[PDB]
Each structure stands twice: as C-alpha cells, then as structure tokens.
Amino acid sequence: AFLSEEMIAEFKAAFDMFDADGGGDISTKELGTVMRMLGQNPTKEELDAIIEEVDEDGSGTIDFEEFLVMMVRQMK
C-alpha cells in the first residue's frame, strides 16, 4: 500500500556488491564503504555510535535487518 522502494533497492544494490556472506551480512569495514557510495561521510563519532549501539551479528559482521532500520532513518 505505502512503502519506500527507490532508497531500499539502492541500499540492497551496494550491500550485495560489497558481500561478506552473499545476500545477508557484510563486514564491519564494508559498513563505512557502502555509506561513502550512497551519500554519507563515515566519521569517528558516527562509526563508534553505530557498531556499539546496533550490534555486530558475529565478531565484526553487520546484517541487513538492523542495518536497514539505522541507515534509512539517519541517511534518508
């Protein structure tokens, strides 16, 4: 009925290109790489606040469910 399709499909396109697992999880350094490709500078305060509050699935490996909730609200 009412959903955001243009920005969600562009976040998934950069995520699947920079893949650690395949279509599910990307690495801790690849979170900063995808943010530069879309339109957001990964600063020391932004990177610290995102991996510490929004957890890493394994050791340093962020997944798309918690990633898409924090990335759509901050860089909209």
Side-chain angles (χ1 to χ4, degrees):
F2 291 98
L3 62 87
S4 294
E5 189 62 81
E6 293 181 87
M7 59 180 173
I8 284 56
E10 199 175 68
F11 295 130
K12 179 172 62 64
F15 195 85
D16 196 81
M17 188 185 281
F18 287 108
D19 66 279
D21 184 82
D25 299 48
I26 66 172
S27 296
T28 49
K29 293 181 180 180
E30 291 182 306
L31 200 173
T33 182
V34 292
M35 284 181 158
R36 295 178 183 102
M37 188 181 170
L38 273 286
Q40 183 71 88
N41 82 81
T43 182
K44 63 186 284 79
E45 191 180 272
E46 189 182 290
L47 289 167
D48 200 271
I50 271 64
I51 85 294
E52 192 179 87
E53 194 281 282
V54 181
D55 73 84
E56 297 296 282
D57 197 86
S59 183
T61 38
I62 190 65
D63 77 278
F64 206 58
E65 293 179 89
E66 67 179 321
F67 173 96
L68 195 68
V69 175
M70 71 77 190
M71 199 179 197
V72 173
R73 296 301 295 114
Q74 185 184 262
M75 57 193 282
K76 199 174 186 72

